Amino acid sequence: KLTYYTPEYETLDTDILAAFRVSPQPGVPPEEAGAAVAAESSTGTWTTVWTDGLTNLDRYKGRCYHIEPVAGEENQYICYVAYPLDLFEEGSVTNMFTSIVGNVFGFKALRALRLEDLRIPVAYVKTFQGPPHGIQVERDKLNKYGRPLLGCTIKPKLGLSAKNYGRAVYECLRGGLDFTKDDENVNSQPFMRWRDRFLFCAEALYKAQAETGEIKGHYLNATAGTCEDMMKRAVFARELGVPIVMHDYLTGGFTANTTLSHYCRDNGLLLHIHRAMHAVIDRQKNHGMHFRVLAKALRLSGGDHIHSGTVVERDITLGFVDLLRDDYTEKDRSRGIYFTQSWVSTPGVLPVASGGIHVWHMPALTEIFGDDSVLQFGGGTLGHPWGNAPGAVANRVALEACVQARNEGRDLAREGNTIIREATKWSPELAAACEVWK
């Protein structure tokens, strides 16, 4: 406790700050718990060692500088810990997580532990490449402005032949969607090897683009068992001249993700990030890591898109959406933002809303996320009674109807449904969709 609980400590602008939600074992006071978290995540040794005298350990120790009770919770506190800049490897998210989160969660004096937020100092931020492209560049490359982008996940995820998969891709895109997507599970399997899929999806997306005149893309999943296999897939995507590839950053890992992110920057490929496995870690309020921490890490490692849930708790989501897109976000406890975060011009990441959404959610999604977002409609497109193309048309029309209405000053929250119903009067495709889903 003496060495690690330092309530008088003034944080340095170069310190990495962590906000831990600590649930001590009964009988362990706050201060000791917080001191334990700091020691266990930095120096701290169960027994005295003579080697400590060869260095100045105060220069390397973690410090619990502040503790505050959690409202309405039995024996739970938020402990703030500061880690000096020197403890971390430059440009390595892998090392950042290993140092802060690699050991403490198993400390016996704690019954549970959750990392809620991290303040990444700008001096450390400058050591990462960040997104290969980012929001602004992506919009400029694709030439798409003033509206959320639209995508669609191809289903069934497993079972279709590569050609039948490409057929679904073409029908979706030609109807007005900007992107189609490989499911996170779709890598390379017996009934559909990756190369065949890349090849047919390329034929499909080029045909749709030629037909409509609008730029199209398909998130070709490059997630693989080894770095070598992953790179082989990214390289073929480059050879095909397509605009975007995909990676499951948590199951693939941060080391592989950073490699992919760097290659994408060097080759002009946009990178879509899927958060498969996140709920294993970020779901329970008492133990794990909140998604906002995983989101910050991805912005550093690199990605142009990242799945962020559907919303339709709101405030928490909007909070981390700001952290992904903005250059500076002030502390705001009402939105789960524990530290003010600056990004010193590191590009923003496009949040991707997905999960059982359909035409009727359009006004809400446009309202909540705004223009800079990607709305993904899997079953919402492929479940339309007339097929993929009209399904895509219904989604594109619904979205544009909402955008126009918003731009004219209409309140999307008050009159969303009115806006949609009005559009059904002139769009048969949309009318048909509205009949099936509400």
Binding site: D140, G146, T212, G268, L269, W386
Partner: protein, 123 residues
Amino acid sequence: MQVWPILNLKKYETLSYLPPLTTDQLARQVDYLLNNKWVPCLEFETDHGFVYREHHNSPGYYDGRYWTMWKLPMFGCTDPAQVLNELEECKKEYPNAFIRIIGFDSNREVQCISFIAYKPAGY
């Protein structure tokens, strides 16, 4: 069950899937730019109204994205009528061209708007 058309169904991004804008709704979209302090500008193209690939094929490279600027961005514009007036003058000079209205957000330092305002006969 209607089948989505294949022929002559080329689109022009934002707002192109809605019925053609009337002068009134066209003025409302321009008011949206002004109210947000975005600078309006006009672009026209006579030869290639859609994206294609002639000079290169690497990821993210496409030809036909840049159209040609009608005069200059209307910095200090305060009235939507100013913009629609230029639209009219542009159309007068290039009735064979596609014309779109774009907006620049000097604060975000990027182009932020782009919607088709005029299409030649048969488009």
